[PDB]
Design a protein around this ligand. Structure first.
Ligand SMILES: OC[C@H]1O[C@H](O[C@@H]2[C@@H](O[C@@H]3[C@H](O)[C@@H](OC[C@H]4O[C@@H](O)[C@@H](O)[C@@H](O[C@H]5O[C@H](CO)[C@@H](O)[C@H](O)[C@@H]5O[C@H]5O[C@H](CO)[C@@H](O)[C@H](O)[C@@H]5O[C@H]5O[C@H](CO)[C@@H](O)[C@H](O)[C@@H]5O)[C@@H]4O)O[C@H](CO)[C@H]3O)O[C@H](CO)[C@@H](O)[C@@H]2O)[C@@H](O)[C@@H](O)[C@@H]1O
Ligand SMILES: [Ca+2]
Ligand SMILES: [Ca+2]
Ligand code: NA
Length: 143
């Protein structure tokens, strides 16, 4: 089942997915390692989330549980601080919302969004083989 909204054409998302902008989003409450999280999003036709604007992140974090961290579509494969987005958008020309003091270790090659007060939601690099929740993102279905 799809839930469709008018585009002023229709923008459709799977019924259990949250809608925003030109993308659909799914918040996976099952804890997996990063590579298994990406494969789970790929099995639904999506990828791990790629943050393109601040507004996209503000919508997403309203759906999250503050007591958990969520894997993002951002990784450092060679541990050389060369962060790459899962959909090959340029990391240098894109938004970056790292927490104060992050990233902070080349061995932490995967990016996660987490709630650290007083700052709140922000990115943190973590070990990829740690099991955490994740966020998937696919484009809207236009009919
Ligand atoms: O773990 C078992 C018990 O842990 C807790 O016990 C209490 C805990 O108190 C701490 C500290 O007082 C303090 O820590 C601040 C920082 O201090 C530094 O000296 C250093 O130790 C930091 O440790 C980081 O780096 C080491 C690398 O060796 C990691 O092993 C460690 O997990 C930590 O890395 C995390 O945090 C950094 C930010 O500093 C991130 O950049 C990393 O990516 C990583 O993030 C993960 O962890 C955080 C939180 O754990 C999580 O939110 C993320 O999502 C990632 O999963 C150290 O951080 O302050 C903190 C907070 O104010 C405080 O909790 O340890 C004391 C002994 O060390 C102990 O006496 C305390 O009781 C507590 O959870 C117990 O219930 C557990 O049994
Ligand atoms: Ca996006
Ligand atoms: Ca870190
Ligand atoms: Na890192």
């Amino acid at each position: 089942a799809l839930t469709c909204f008018s585009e002023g054409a229709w923008g459709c998302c799977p019924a259990s997915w949250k809608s925003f902008g030109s993308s659909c989003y799914f918040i996976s409450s099952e804890e997996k390692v990063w590579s298994k999280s990406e494969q789970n999003c790929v099995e639904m036709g999506a990828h791990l989330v790629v943050f393109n604007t601040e507004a996209e992140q503000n919508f997403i974090v309203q759906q999250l549980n503050e007591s958990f961290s969520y894997f993002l579509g951002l990784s450092d494969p060679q541990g050389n601080n060369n962060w790459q987005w899962i959909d090959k958008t340029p990391y240098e020309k894109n938004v970056r919302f790292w927490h104060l003091g992050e990233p902070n270790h080349s061995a932490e090659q995967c990016a996660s969004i987490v709630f650290w007060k007083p700052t709140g939601w922000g990115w943190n690099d973590v070990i990829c083989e740690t099991r955490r929740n994740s966020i998937c993102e696919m484009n809207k279905i236009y009919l």
